[PDB]
C-alpha cells in the first residue's frame, strides 16, 4: 500500500552517460553503441546563442575538436553530423554497456524519468510529465544540458527527451532523440513564447482512482454526468477536456474499483466547480496530474513482466 | 532552476539485489561480497507471524533450504545466522558488483532513497523521510520485503534501511542493516503501537529557503522571533521543536539568501499560526518536510565531489 511518485531505476542509463567537451562549455551526452548524442549548442562559444548560426559555427569544428569522457579515457571521434538540434559524435568503440532502446516522441500528458547529470556524472532521478505546452517543470542547474528522460518496461530503455534549455520564466525545454524540439521552441537565447499550461485531466482521474484503491475513497459524491457536461466545467478551469480515448484508457481502473469513469468525472467537478478548502487526497492538497493511467496500474495493480 | 524531490541514482544498488526463496514465501535480499542480507521472516510459513518463534523456526531450516537468484543461477549457500531481525546467507561467491558501502542508523528527520523490488527485480525509486515515529510513508506491495533504502555521496552507497512490514494502518516499518528495528516495532503480525507523527520543523525551514532561492520569496514577513517563542507555536501545531543544532545546520542557507534563521522561523509561524488558504510555495499547497538542509544545498548550491 501507499502511493509515491516513483521514477524508473536508472542503472541502465547511468552507463550510457558521458562528458562532451568541445573547446570550452562542458555538458552531457548519451553514449549508445558507437555514437554519442548531445545538444548541438555544445559548439556555441561563438557570439553565444544570442543569435547563433549553427551550420556556420559547426564548420569551424573538426572531427577532433570533440573530446568525450566516459568515466576515464577519451573515446576518439571518427565522425560528426548535425541532425536538427542534436549532434552525433561517431566514436571508434561501441559502448559495451548499451541496452535495448528506442527513441520515441512522447506526447504531452505522459510521464518519464529524468536522470539529471553534470559533466557526465549522475546527480539524481525524478519523475515528470510533459506539460500540454511541451515544456517540463524540471530541476536543472548549469551544466545539465544533455541530460535525458527515459521510459522502461522490459530490460528495454525507451529514451524520449534530451534537456536543452531553461526558458526565461523558469521552465525547461528540450528535444526528442533526433533533435526536433517539443513545442515551438528554438535553441537560441531569446524570449520564447509559451502558451497555456493545462492540467492533464485524464491523469488527475487516474490519481483519484489510486486514492480510492489506496484508502481514500470519500471525495465521491452522489451525482453523475455526461462527458459534454464535464468538459464545459473542464474547459472553464483550464483542464484538458476529455474524449473517448481517455475514457477507455481508464477502463480497468473503473473495473477494479467498481466506479464508472463518468461518476469519477462527476466527483472531480464538485472538486473543480464548487469546492475550495480543507481535506486531503492521497496526501496532497492539490489535484496531482503527473500520474498517467499506466503509472497507476503499476504502482497499484497489473504487473509488467521481468 | 526548479525544485524536485530527486532520488539518488539507483544503478549501484540494482546489482546488489537478489531473490531469496526458502520453501515458499518469496522476497528480496541484498547481495554484498559473499553474503546475502534479508528479512528473517523469509523462514515464516510456520503458523505465520500471528505469533512466530523465530529461533525455533530457524532450526528446521538447513543451509540449503535457502535458494537465492541473482539474475540467473542459484548462488549456493554455505552458511546462515540469524542476527536480530536479519538473516545472513553465507554464499560461495562474492558479488562481483558490490561497491563501497557502510550500514548506518539514520535518525528520524533524515531522508533516503528506496529501491522498490519484487522477487529480486527493480520496480522503481522514490525519496522518503524517516518520520519522527520511525515509520516511513512508503509504497510497497506484497513481495517487496527486503527492499532497501540508501544514501550516496561518492561512488559509496550508505545502505540504511530494509523493508520488513506494513502496519495495520497503512504505514511501513523496517530495520537497519544489522536488524534492529527503527521504532518499537516487532516482526509479528500484531497491531503495532505508533505514536504521533511530527512534522520535521528543520526540514520545512530548509524547503522555505529553497523556495526563496528558486523564485518564491514572498512568504516572508516583517516580524521576527526567539527560538523559545517559535517552539511554543511549534509544539502546539505538532512540529518538532527547534534547538541549536538545527539553527547551525541551516547556516549557509541563511548566508546565501541573507535571511536570519530566526526571521525564517518568524514567517513560518504566520503560516503555522494565523494562516489558512490561497497561495502556493514551490508548487505545494502544504509545508513539505522531506527535504533536509543537505538535500537542498545539493538541489541548489555546493557540489559534492565526483
Ligand atoms: Zn543544452
Ligand atoms: Zn518482510
From Swiss-Prot, chains A, B:
Q: Which domain of life is it from?
A: Viruses
Catalytic machinery residues: 41 (for 3cl-pro activity), 145 (nucleophile)
Which residues belong to any copy of the Peptidase C30 domain?
Answer: 1-306
How the protein is activated or inhibited is described as: Inhibited by pyridone-containing alpha-ketoamides compounds 13a and 13b. In turn, alpha-ketoamide 13b (tert-butyl (1-((S)-1-(((S)-4-(benzylamino)-3,4-dioxo-1-((S)-2-oxopyrrolidin-3-yl)butan-2-yl)amino)-3-cyclopropyl-1-oxopropan-2-yl)-2-oxo-1,2-dihydropyridin-3-yl)carbamate) inhibits SARS-CoV-2 replication in human lung cells. Inhibited ex vivo by michael acceptor inhibitor N3. Inhibited ex vivo by compound 11a and 11b.
Membrane-side (Cytoplasmic) residue stretches: 1-306
Phenotype for residue 90 to R: In strain: Beta/B.1.351
Instruction: Report which reactions are catalysed by this protein.
Output: TSAVLQ-|-SGFRK-NH2 and SGVTFQ-|-GKFKK the two peptides corresponding to the two self-cleavage sites of the SARS 3C-like proteinase are the two most reactive peptide substrates. The enzyme exhibits a strong preference for substrates containing Gln at P1 position and Leu at P2 position
Where located? Host cytoplasm; Host Golgi apparatus; Host nucleus
Its biological purpose: Cleaves the C-terminus of replicase polyprotein at 11 sites. Recognizes substrates containing the core sequence [ILMVF]-Q-|-[SGACN]. Cleaves and inactivates human TRMT1, preventing tRNA guanine(26)-dimethylation of tRNAs. May cleave human NLRP1 in lung epithelial cells, thereby activating the NLRP1 inflammasome pathway. May cleave human GSDMD, triggering alternative GSDME-mediated epithelial cell death upon activation of the NLRP1 inflammasome, which may enhance the release interleukins 1B, 6, 16 and 18. Also able to bind an ADP-ribose-1''-phosphate (ADRP).
Fill in the subunit field for this protein. Answer: 3CL-PRO exists as monomer and homodimer. Only the homodimer shows catalytic activity. Interacts with host FBXO22; this interaction promotes the proteasomal degradation of nsp5.
Q: What is this protein called?
A: 3C-like proteinase nsp5
Residues of the whole record sequence present? 3264 to 3569 of 7096
Amino acid at each position: 500500500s501507499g502511493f509515491r511518485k516513483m521514477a524508473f531505476p536508472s542503472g541502465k542509463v547511468e552507463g550510457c552517460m558521458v562528458q562532451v567537451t568541445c573547446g570550452t562549455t562542458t555538458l552531457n551526452g548519451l553514449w549508445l553503441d558507437d555514437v554519442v548524442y548531445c545538444p548541438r549548442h555544445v559548439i556555441c562559444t561563438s557570439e553565444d546563442m544570442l543569435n547563433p548560426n549553427y551550420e556556420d559555427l559547426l564548420i569551424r569544428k573538426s572531427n577532433h575538436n570533440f573530446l568525450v569522457q566516459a568515466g576515464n579515457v577519451q573515446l576518439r571521434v571518427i565522425g560528426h553530423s548535425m541532425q536538427n538540434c542534436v549532434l552525433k559524435l561517431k566514436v571508434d568503440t561501441a559502448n559495451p554497456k548499451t541496452p535495448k532502446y528506442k527513441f520515441v516522441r512522447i506526447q504531452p500528458g505522459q510521464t518519464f524519468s529524468v536522470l539529471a547529470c553534470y559533466n557526465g556524472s549522475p546527480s539524481g532521478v525524478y519523475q515528470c510529465a510533459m506539460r500540454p505546452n511541451f515544456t517540463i517543470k524540471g530541476s536543472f542547474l548549469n551544466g545539465s544540458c544533455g541530460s535525458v528522460g527515459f521510459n522502461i518496461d522490459y530490460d528495454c530503455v525507451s529514451f524520449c527527451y534530451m534537456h536543452h534549455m531553461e526558458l526565461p520564466t523558469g521552465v525547461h525545454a528540450g528535444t526528442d532523440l533526433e533533435g526536433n524540439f517539443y513545442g515551438p521552441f528554438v535553441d537560441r537565447q531569446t524570449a520564447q513564447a509559451a502558451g497555456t499550461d493545462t492540467t492533464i485531466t485524464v491523469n488527475v482521474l487516474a490519481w483519484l482512482y489510486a486514492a480510492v484503491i489506496n484508502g481514500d475513497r470519500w471525495f465521491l459524491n452522489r451525482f453523475t454526468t455526461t462527458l459534454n457536461d464535464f468538459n464545459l466545467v473542464a474547459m472553464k478551469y483550464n483542464y484538458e477536456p476529455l474524449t473517448q480515448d481517455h475514457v477507455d484508457i481508464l477502463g480497468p481502473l473503473s473495473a477494479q474499483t467498481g466506479i464508472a469513469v463518468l461518476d469519477m468525472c462527476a466527483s472531480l467537478k464538485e472538486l473543480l466547480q464548487n469546492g475550495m478548502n480543507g481535506r486531503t487526497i492521497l496526501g496532497s492538497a492539490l489535484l496531482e496530474d503527473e500520474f498517467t493511467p499506466f503509472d497507476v496500474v503499476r504502482q497499484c495493480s497489473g504487473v509488467t513482466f521481468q
